[PDB]
Amino acid sequence: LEKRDEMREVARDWLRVGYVLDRLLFRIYLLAVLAYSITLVTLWSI
Amino acid sequence: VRGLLQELSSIRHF
């Protein structure tokens, strides 16, 4: 029982890490897209 | 007194 439970807890922690990294990289990607877009429109205006 | 309960408690916990 604890043999399975241990691996379940480890998988839970790796899930935590993966989730944090995923959210952070989501922020980064979103900001990157917005910046690329604002450069696009600043080029469009000029 | 027997320590069988400390095992069952853990199993139930899981």
Swiss-Prot record, chain A:
- Where is it expressed, tissue-wise? Brain, spinal cord, and heart.
> Which residue ranges run through the membrane?
28-46
Report the locations given in the UniProt record: Postsynaptic cell membrane; Cell membrane
* Assembly and interaction partners: Forms homopentameric as well as heteropentameric serotonin-activated cation-selective channel complexes with HTR3B or HTR3C or HTR3D or HTR3E. The homomeric complex is functional but exhibits low conductance with modified voltage dependence, and decreased agonist and antagonist affinity. Heteropentameric complexes display properties which resemble that of neuronal serotonin-activated channels in vivo. Interacts with RIC3.
Q: What does this protein do?
A: Forms serotonin (5-hydroxytryptamine/5-HT3)-activated cation-selective channel complexes, which when activated cause fast, depolarizing responses in neurons.
The entry's free-text remark on domains says: The HA-stretch region of HTR3A seems to be responsible for the low conductance of HTR3A homomers compared to that of HTR3A/HTR3B heteromers.
Q: What family is this protein classified in?
A: Belongs to the ligand-gated ion channel (TC 1.A.9) family. 5-hydroxytryptamine receptor (TC 1.A.9.2) subfamily. HTR3A sub-subfamily.
* Protein name, UniProt field: 5-hydroxytryptamine receptor 3A
- Native organism is Mus musculus
Q: Which gene encodes it?
A: Htr3a
Please give the first and last residues shown and the length of the full protein. 440 to 485 of 489
Curated annotation (Swiss-Prot), chain B:
Subcellular localization is given as:
Postsynaptic cell membrane; Cell membrane
Name the domain of life.
Eukaryota
Q: In which tissues is it expressed?
A: Brain, spinal cord, and heart.
Describe the task this protein carries out: Forms serotonin (5-hydroxytryptamine/5-HT3)-activated cation-selective channel complexes, which when activated cause fast, depolarizing responses in neurons.
Q: Which family is this sequence assigned to? A: Belongs to the ligand-gated ion channel (TC 1.A.9) family. 5-hydroxytryptamine receptor (TC 1.A.9.2) subfamily. HTR3A sub-subfamily.
Q: What is known of its domains?
A: The HA-stretch region of HTR3A seems to be responsible for the low conductance of HTR3A homomers compared to that of HTR3A/HTR3B heteromers.
Q: How does it assemble?
A: Forms homopentameric as well as heteropentameric serotonin-activated cation-selective channel complexes with HTR3B or HTR3C or HTR3D or HTR3E. The homomeric complex is functional but exhibits low conductance with modified voltage dependence, and decreased agonist and antagonist affinity. Heteropentameric complexes display properties which resemble that of neuronal serotonin-activated channels in vivo. Interacts with RIC3.
Q: What is this protein called?
A: 5-hydroxytryptamine receptor 3A
Measured against the full-length protein, the chain present covers 426 to 439 of 489
